[PDB]
Amino acid sequence: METFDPTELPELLKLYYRRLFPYSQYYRWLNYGGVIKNYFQHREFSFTLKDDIYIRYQSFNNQSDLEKEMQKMNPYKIDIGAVYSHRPNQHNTVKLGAFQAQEKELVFDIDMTDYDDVRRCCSSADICPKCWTLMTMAIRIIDRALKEDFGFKHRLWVYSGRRGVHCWVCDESVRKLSSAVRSGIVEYLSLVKGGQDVKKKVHLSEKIHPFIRKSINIIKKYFEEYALVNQDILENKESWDKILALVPETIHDELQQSFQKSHNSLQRWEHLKKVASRYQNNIGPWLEWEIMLQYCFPRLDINVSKGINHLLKSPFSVHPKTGRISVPIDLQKVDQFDPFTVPTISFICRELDAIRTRDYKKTSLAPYVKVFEHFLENLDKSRKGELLK
Amino acid sequence: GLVLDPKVGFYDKFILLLDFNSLYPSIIQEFNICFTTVQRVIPELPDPSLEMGILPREIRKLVERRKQVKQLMKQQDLNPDLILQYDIRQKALKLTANSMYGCLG
Amino acid sequence: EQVFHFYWLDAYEDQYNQPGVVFLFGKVWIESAETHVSCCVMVKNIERTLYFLPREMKIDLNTGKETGTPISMKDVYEEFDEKIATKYKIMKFKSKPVEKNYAFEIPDVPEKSEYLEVKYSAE
Amino acid sequence: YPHCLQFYLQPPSENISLIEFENLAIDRVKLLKSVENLGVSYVKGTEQYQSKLESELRKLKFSYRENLEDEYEPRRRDHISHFILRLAYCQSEELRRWFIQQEMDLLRFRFSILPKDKIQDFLKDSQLQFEAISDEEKTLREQEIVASSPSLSGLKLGFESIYKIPFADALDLFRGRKVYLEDGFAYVPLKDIVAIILNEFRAKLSKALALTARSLPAVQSDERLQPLLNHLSH
Ligand SMILES: [Zn+2]
């Protein structure tokens, strides 16, 4: 991947929003088949334009407005809010109190600056092959739930642009959930109690609910691949001093000599697996899993999914810093998802210059546009199924 | 307005008769009630997060000026004609407000 | 050019007889007399100012339905200029598009919207 | 007592004699004023309580003898009485609380009397949607239900019937991970199911005592109702 040049952005933007973005698929989606009054005409979208000017209550009549105004404003940022009771572009029009958010997707945001104390490869704001296993775990941990625990069927994950991944819970019954319930969702799916810098941030009790236990089951298939060989979480005392800080002080001394005489974390983990295991029996706290948790379990932002009116980054947008396309995820191949191979808007605008419209196909953008289509197709299903039956 | 049934009867001991200072006048302030705050078509006081509206913003100034005046009446080594002046200007700013209500109902 | 000051008190308008004109009574000061005197000033040419609420869609008022043509200010203008002006005897006037809030007791009226500001002689 | 547990929802359209109208209230209060005492001198789980409580429920004629489909003596008493005594207790936010307080201590007792069985039927029917699971799905998912439950001692998933509700209605409990969830459904017992009832019952009741006041001005005018509005405790 060649260096993304952010001074070219103003050039590439009008060319991308002109010939490569998926307007057809974006409408078809937020439109949800015109099954209802004005679900798109009442949908809010936010754009960050030139000079950093931030406009918000935008709204449109049809797919056509979307283009003209988006090829005429070439935004640097684009967000999808919720659908209100009256045309967003017309709130000056209404009384103050009758204009309100009524429905929006249920979105979950998982970023990399949330595990700034668990990674030993990247800085807060960056990522690389070695710690990206954290986004894949978050993926099947919650996607898992939303589907298994709640029965949410149409989950669309996308690439946030640089160090995280977002979720779009689009089941019809979900877009209309009360904020109160949405908070209940995150509450259920949340385990890392990160206080004002507290060492131990994962406490378990003797009985461990299904998700907790199913989750720990999925934090096991990746555990040593990532934490003990990719991260080598316990190769130094500085490093291991940090994992001991979760176990009861009386265990240290023994483990401290256990890893001193060991020569790689892999053997150092098997060591606590014992000591602690031995700890458990005579004393339990499940020391083995509480640490795999505070290191492998997703950390969400409550304000994000809670708000039924929160503006979140629009899929297939462009990231100003890295340039990468905010691509939807292919859950049939989570563990094969590559952030590093994700199409650059510069790169995709180069592939159309080295060349009824389907030229998105002629770019490497094409593969991510199909995962978006299978999504629109599974939804067509629901409408069809659920309604016409 | 509410009326509490008077305890007909005599009273040996003292009777403290307390009262409120310009009731509906203040209420149209407390609960930001207005022609651009309230939802109408016995509606619901909008939320305390909405800003003032035309009406409160004119009952606002109405006491922003009773502030100044109550304070310039504190000044000493002052014109004992302006004493009687400020006093009336007081009472006025007062009346206007109150009836602000009688204006809506 | 030339001008004089005067503190007023009361006033009066004769709509019936003299529209577009109001009388301001008061008081003026005159050196020549070392005391002020009553004083009346007349104000003429006080144009009626009107506001027209454009519709979102042109309607055939007879039957009561749209014609598929969205409304613009030029639309309204020409409706007054040609169909309302004449019918009601209005030769000259002033028309200006302007932004105006609103928040009172008339159903189906936007708290804010562009209107047709029309001004014409009180006569 | 019987199909005597009822969500005082949907207003009585009948009509009565100022003699029944007045007696339903005095009485309906006497009860509610006895629910108050017992809760003060005893506890919510004692026989004396349960006993005397149903004893008055009895003496005031509010749970007993049947009849031909329409006119069910006590059923009626309790329905009106409650609503009528919504007038009086709608005013002071100190009565609204006290009312709700004692009219909820009451639904609680009329629930503490029915067996894990009769309370079931009442739900299926009641509001609208709730379902029970056979011993097949029951034991199949038994262990997982006991794992999601509270500090609930032992591995005993008793005979105590288990229900399947929309995850959304059990927010209050899944948010704390206190029940088993599956494809959008929660599984909870009686204890907790009840508390949720009582919970939504207060919130709705309060809601109403609210809309009772708003439209009170249209009757304070009536002469026959001063002794109720003003004097049910003077
Ligand atoms: Zn890394």
CATH of the domain at A48: 3.90.920.10
Q: If you search the block for the tokens 């009895």, which residue do you land on?
A: D58
Give strand pairing partners of A235: none
- Residue B103 pairs in a beta bridge with none
Determine whether the interchain pair D181/A149 forms a contact, defined as Cβ–Cβ distance below 8 Å.
yes
A330 is catalytic: no
| Residue A214 Cα to ligand 1 middle (Å) | 26
Nearest CA to A207 among D186, D191, D179, D150? D150
DSSP assignment of A144-184, as one string?
HHHHHTT----EEEEE-SSSEEEEEE--HHHHT--HHHHHH
**Number of residue pairs across A and C with CB atoms under 8 Å?**
13
Q: Where are the beta strands (DSSP E) in chain A?
A: 43-48, 54-58, 77-84, 101-103, 106-111, 155-159, 164-169, 312-313
Bridge partners (DSSP) of residue D109 are none
- Chain-centre distance for alpha carbon C90: 14
Closest residue by Cα to residue D174 from A183, A141, A167 = A183
Inter-chain CB proximity A150 and D148 less than 8 Å: no
Sequence-ordered list of residues with C-beta below 8 angstroms from that of B24, at least 6 positions apart, any chain: B98, B101
- A338 CA to centre of ligand 1 in angstroms: 13
Burial B52-84 (b: 16+ CB within 10 A, else e): ebebbeebeebbeebeebeeeeeeeeeeeeeee
C103–B36 C-beta distance less than 8 A? yes
Half-sphere exposure in the Cβ direction for A143 (13 Å, CA): 22
Domains contained in chain A, number: 1
- Report how far apart the first and last C-alpha atoms of chain D are (Å, whole number): 32
Q: What is the C-alpha separation between C67 and C56, in angstroms, rounded?
A: 11
DSSP chain D: --TT-----S-------HHHHHHHHHHHHHHHHHHHHHHHHS-TT-HHHHHHHHHHHHHTT-S----STT--HHHHHHHHHHHHHHHGGGSSHHHHHHHHHHTHHHHHHHHHSS-TTHHHHHHHHSSS--EE--HHHHHHTHHHHHHHSSS--SS---SS--EEEEGGGGHHHHTTT-SEE-SSEEEE-HHHHHHHHHHHHHHHHHHHHHHHHTT-TTTTT-STTHHHHT-S--
User: Among B55, B61, B50, which Cα is nearest to B24's?
Assistant: B55
What is the Cα–Cα distance from D187 to D181, expressed in whole angstroms? 7
Please give the single-letter amino acid code of residue D217. P
> What is the residue whose two structure tokens read 């009008």?
A14
The token pair that represents D17 in the structure block: 């004699």
DSSP string, C33-81: GTEEEEEEEEEE---EEEEE---SEEEETTTTEEEEEE--HHHHHHHII
Catalytic-role residue among A109, A143, A171, A290: A109
CB contact under 8 A, A95 and B39: yes
**CA-CA-CA-CA torsion sign (A369, A371, A373, A379):** negative
CA distance A244 to D107: 53
A79: β partners: A46, A313
A11 catalytic per annotation: no
In a domain? residue D78: yes
Q: Which domain holds residue A108?
A: 1-389
Q: Which of C53, C111, C113 is best to mutate for the A interface (most A CBs within 10 A)? A: C111
Q: Does C106 touch chain A (CB under 8 A)?
A: no
Q: Give Rg (Cα) of chain A.
A: 23
Q: What is the CATH number of the domain that holds D77?
A: 1.20.930.80
> How far apart (Å, rounded) are the C-alpha atoms in residues A105 and C28?
72
To one decimal, the resolution in angstroms is 3.6
As a whole number of angstroms, the distance between CA B23 and CA B43 comes to 19
Experimental method: X-ray
Report residue D45 as tokens: 């789980």
Q: How far away, in angstroms, is A128 Cα from ligand 1 center?
A: 4
A111: annotated active-site residue: yes
**How far does Cα C55 stand from its chain's mean position?**
21
For chain D, the domain total comes to 1
A173 marked among binding-site residues: no
Neighbours of ion ligand 1 (CB under 5 A): A 121-122, 128, 130-131
Q: What is the DSSP letter of C95?
A: E
Rounded CA-CA distance A285/A272 in Å is 14
Chains D and A make contact, 3+ CB pairs within 8 Å: yes
Please state, in angstroms and as integers, the Cα–Cα distance from residue C7 to each residue in A17, A134, C25, C29, C44, following that order: 66, 80, 9, 9, 19
Cβ <8 Å between D168 and A177: yes
Instruction: Please give the residue range of the domain that contains residue C67.
Output: 48-123
Length of chain C: 123
Distance from CA of A96 to the nearest CA of B (A): 7
Integer-rounded Cα Rg, in Å, for chain D is 20
Asked if residues A319 and A344 have their Cβ atoms less than 8 Å apart, the reply is: no
| R_g over Cα of chain C | 22
Whole-number Å distance, alpha carbon A82 to ligand 1 midpoint, is: 34
**Interface contact A97-B36, CB threshold 8 A:** no
Task: Tally the C-alpha atoms within 13 A of residue A74's C-alpha that lie toward its C-beta.
Answer: 14
Residues of A with a Cβ under 8 Å from any B Cβ are 95-98
Q: Which residues contact D7 (CB under 8 A, 6 or more apart)?
A: D126, D127, D201, D204
Residue of C nearest to B39 (CA): C103
What angle do the packed helices D190-213 and D118-125 form, to 10 degrees?
A: 50
Identify the helix (H) or strand (E) that includes residue B7.
none
Sort out which chain D residues have CB atoms less than 8 A from A215's CB and list them: none
Torsion sign (Cα): A82, A84, A86, A88: negative
> Within a domain: residue D2?
no
- CA D185, distance to chain mean position in Å, is 24
| Cα–Cα distance for residue pair A296/A292, rounded to 1 Å | 6
Q: How far is B29 from B26, CA to CA, in rounded Å?
A: 5
DSSP one-letter code for C30 = E
Cβ–Cβ gap A92/C110 under 8 Å: yes
Any known ligand binding at A97?
no
Contacts A187 to D, Cβ<8 Å: 175-177
Residues whose CB falls within 8 Å of the CB of residue A92, separated by 6 or more in sequence, listed in order: C110, C111, C112, C113
**A115 alpha carbon – ligand 1 mean position (Å):** 11
Nearest to D216 by CA among D49, D90, D44: D90
For residue C67, give the CATH number of its domain. 3.30.70.2820
Beta-carbon contacts of residue A83 (< 8 Å; ≥ 6 apart): A38, A39, A40, A42, A43, A44, A101, A102, A103, A104, A175
Q: Tell whether D1 is covered by a domain.
A: no
Find the closest chain A residue to B47 by CA distance. Answer: A97
Residue type, C23: F
**Beta-strand pair A77-84/A312-313:** antiparallel
Residue pointed to by tokens 């005031």: D60
